[PDB]
Amino acid sequence: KKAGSAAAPFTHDTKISSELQKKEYKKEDLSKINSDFKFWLSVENTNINYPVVQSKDNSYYLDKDFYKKDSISGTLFMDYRNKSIDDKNIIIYGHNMKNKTMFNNLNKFKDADFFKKNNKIKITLNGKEFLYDVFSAYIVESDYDYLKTNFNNESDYQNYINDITSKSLYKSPIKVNSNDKIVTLSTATYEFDDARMVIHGRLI
Amino acid sequence: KKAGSAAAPFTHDTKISSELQKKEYKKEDLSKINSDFKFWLSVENTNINYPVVQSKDNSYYLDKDFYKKDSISGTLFMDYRNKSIDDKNIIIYGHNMKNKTMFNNLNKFKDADFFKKNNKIKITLNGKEFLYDVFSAYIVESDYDYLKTNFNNESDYQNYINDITSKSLYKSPIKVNSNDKIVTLSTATYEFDDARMVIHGRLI
């Protein structure tokens, strides 16, 4: 009946994802299933609990599953510019799906209270967990690209931080400086989307 | 470089779509390529100029090209409920793509000045061209399901008309009533889109 409500495509990704959640919990090595795998990602009080891959660009995995087959949800993925631990800003992209999956829940950070509750973003890499507090959340337009992974100096990075901080829908009691590391979570799509969600966390 | 801007998947759909424009101009029979083919759709002062198909639901052709292959743009398709030439409302669905293809240009109707230009919708079927005047246009939440192909009586139909007329961002000269036939063009997607375009024309 409803346009784009058919079950089989969501079932595909739902089945793949949950199976991977199990495998991750048992500490199986997911990079033996896709060498593109980098780390696991979760966010407190969301359903965001997924693997993150990376490829040559910022598109391949939007409509591809963890086994590289076509899929409407895709797999979360790190920006292709990211290289290492040391990067100042880790950027991760995902669909906003209609059964409220992938990065859909990023929308919760629009609630004033949820945002004050200070839910953490969590990255798990080779059995070591890294935590980030959200200091900035906002909504951007289809072709928003103010998303930088690396910087020439302490000063450029500070300016980027001042900028993305001033953009926040809500003021956070966390000042970030040029010695911090940050994470950026972004909605992304091949379709036109003027309501894209952008979240920034600070490494605790 | 930028998230979801990889050329290749768009190239796939541009190639197909412009070949089919050439085939339709030549008056080739497109139902020999795909049985599901129904008619041709264009809209004045837009790049909307595509083939319309129908499956047995409202999802299959969202991410399938006219050769029933995976594609990020899909193929414009008619609501499965439209069975007859005497249906009171014909309803067609399409993607709002980032490269401004498919039903992107429905968004042009958000402009008061494009709206009052009376740009007509065009259905070409078996040689015969059928023309419609756009009398309502608006934005709807991801959920919107107030899309009805048929009605039990002229009172039910008039109420439907009255309602969708009230939603228009703009008032139109054109009065619609329960003896009219109408077309409905809706943006649609597997993702969450609280900014999707619905427009309605009236058969001339």
Residue numbers in the entry:
A (entry chain B), B (entry chain A): 39 to 242
Give excerpts from the publication:
In many gram positive pathogens, adhesins are anchored to the bacterial surface by sortase enzymes, a class of transpeptidases which catalyse a transpeptidation between a peptide motif and the cross-link precursors of the peptidoglycan. The C. difficile 630 genome possesses two genes with homology to known sortase genes in other species, but as one of these is interrupted by an in-frame stop codon, it is thought that only one sortase (SrtB) is present in the bacterium. A recent study demonstrated that SrtB recognises the LPxTG motif within putative sortase substrates. Characterisation the products of the reaction of SrtB with an SPKTG peptide in the presence or absence of meso-DAP clearly demonstrates that the C. difficile sortase is capable of the transpeptidation reactions characteristic of the sortase class, and responsible for their anchoring of proteins to the cell wall.
Despite extensive attempts, it was not possible to crystallise wild type C. difficile SrtB, either under the optimal condition for SrtB C226A or any other condition tested in high throughput screening. High throughput crystallisation screening with both SrtB and SrtB C226A yielded small crystals in one condition with SrtB C226A, consisting of 0.1 M Phosphate/Citrate buffer pH 4.2, 40% PEG300. The crystal structure of C. difficile SrtB C226A reveals a fold that is characteristic of the class B sortases, consisting of an eight stranded discontinuous beta barrel, decorated on its surface by several alpha and 310 helices. As is observed in other class B sortases, the N-terminal region of C. difficile SrtB C226A forms two helices (H1 and H2) arranged in a ‘V' shape pointing away from the active site side of the enzyme. No metal ions were observed in the β6/β7 loop known to participate in Ca2+ ion binding in S. aureus SrtA. This is not surprising given that the loop is devoid of the triad of glutamine residues which co-ordinate metal binding in S. aureus SrtA. A modelled active site was therefore constructed by reversing the mutation in-silico and adjusting the side chain torsion angles to match those of the analogous residues in the S. aureus and B. anthracis SrtB enzymes. The cysteine and arginine residues are found in a deep depression on the surface of the enzyme, while His133 is shielded from the depression by the side chain of tyrosine residue 227 within the β7/β8 loop. The β6/β7 loop of the C. difficile SrtB C226A contains an identical pairing of tyrosine and leucine, suggesting that the ‘SP' portion of the C. difficile sorting signal may be recognised in a similar manner.
